[PDB]
Design a protein around this ligand. Structure first.
Ligand SMILES: O=C1N2C=C(c3ccc(O)cc3)N=C(Cc3ccccc3)C2=N[C@@]1(Cc1ccc(O)cc1)OO
Ligand SMILES: [Ca+2]
Ligand SMILES: [Co+2]
Ligand SMILES: [Co+2]
Ligand SMILES: [K+]
Length: 187
């Protein structure tokens, strides 16, 4: 499968995918999120529960900051969904230009940081833990779906190169080959 490179930013399914994620981040239901909250979730919550080392936590935070700044987030800046989505259009565009130049993307680099906390492969049990800890996929069945969906290595583990290809399609281009990456956890 060739990763779908053309964007599809007006497709209701792409909007819905990010609306789901925004509302997931908007825990207090007030329609706005900040980079502060995202970084706290990354560092104070996820990395702590994963027992990341201090250096791994810091690297992961740099990647989360860069990723979400790429969608227009900033500390102290309260962003609502329409502006957030507009930021994702910009991030996707930028990321696809990097991909075309064979320059590591911000989604790759975030992946590298996540994978390194799990020791560039992750096992299904590690993915299940991530799903619960990050909250993106707390159903272990949806995590099993991710592994069924992806092309796995010879051990049945997931590699960051494959997850990055999947994430380009899932988060940026609405690639049909990426549908179902998170099972039913994320539409
Ligand atoms: O991709 C991922 N995410 C995308 C969004 C997200 C958020 C908003 C959107 O509109 C769309 C997507 N939110 C979270 C969860 C999270 C959010 C904030 C801080 C830390 C973690 C998240 N975790 C990741 C981490 C990851 C990255 C690359 C890999 O190869 C493997 C794992 O795997 O799912
Ligand atoms: Ca909020
Ligand atoms: Co490799
Ligand atoms: Co194979
Ligand atoms: K598979």
């Amino acid at each position: 499968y060739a990763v779908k490179l053309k964007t599809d930013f007006d497709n209701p399914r792409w909007i819905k995918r990010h609306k789901h994620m925004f509302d997931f981040l908007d825990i207090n239901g007030n329609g706005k999120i900040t980079l502060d909250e995202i970084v706290s979730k990354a560092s104070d919550d996820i990395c702590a529960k994963l027992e990341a080392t201090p250096e791994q936590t810091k690297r992961h935070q740099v990647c989360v900051e860069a990723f979400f700044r790429g969608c227009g987030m900033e500390y102290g800046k309260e962003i609502a969904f329409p502006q957030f989505l507009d930021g994702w259009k910009q991030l996707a565009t930028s990321e696809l230009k990097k991909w075309a130049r064979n320059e590591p993307t911000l989604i790759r680099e975030w992946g590298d940081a996540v994978f390194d906390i799990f020791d560039g492969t992750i096992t299904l049990d590690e993915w299940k833990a991530y799903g619960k800890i990050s909250g993106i996929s707390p159903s272990q069945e949806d995590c099993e779906a991710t592994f069924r969906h992806c092309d796995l290595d010879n051990a049945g583990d997931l590699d960051v190169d494959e997850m990055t290809r999947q994430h380009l399609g899932f988060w940026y281009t609405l690639d049909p080959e990426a549908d179902g990456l998170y099972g039913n956890g994320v539409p």
